[PDB]
Write a protein that binds this DNA or RNA. Structure first.
Length: 48
DNA sequence: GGATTACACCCAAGACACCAGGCACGAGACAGAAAAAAACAACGAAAACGGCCACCACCCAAACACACCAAACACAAGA
């Protein structure tokens, strides 16, 4: 359980859009802005 | 099963976690597991009764013969 907690924290530190699982959340209810979410899209690093 | 769905600009409005069961420590009880003893198997030692060879006599087995019966070539009959 605890090693899997480490695995999940490390995974969602990099990619919080993994299919078929909950998202690392903020206590405000929003999901964590992972690095991948930082890099992609119209508003991401590359295009924005 | 995911992933993408125009471009630029302006303004306003609300929030920027609170509260509840788990870790540590905090103490009991049968279960996770450890110690023991008494009725479980065997073997050593004595007792006398069941087992083996005699002795023995009456009942079943073999020989002799009887009459009786089953049976087998063939002289005769027959198609």
């Amino acid at each position: 359980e605890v090693e899997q907690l480490l695995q999940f924290h490390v995974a969602t530190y990099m990619d919080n859009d993994i299919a078929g699982q909950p998202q690392a959340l903020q206590k405000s209810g929003r999901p964590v802005k992972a690095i991948r979410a930082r890099l992609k899209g119209k508003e991401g690093r590359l295009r924005g």
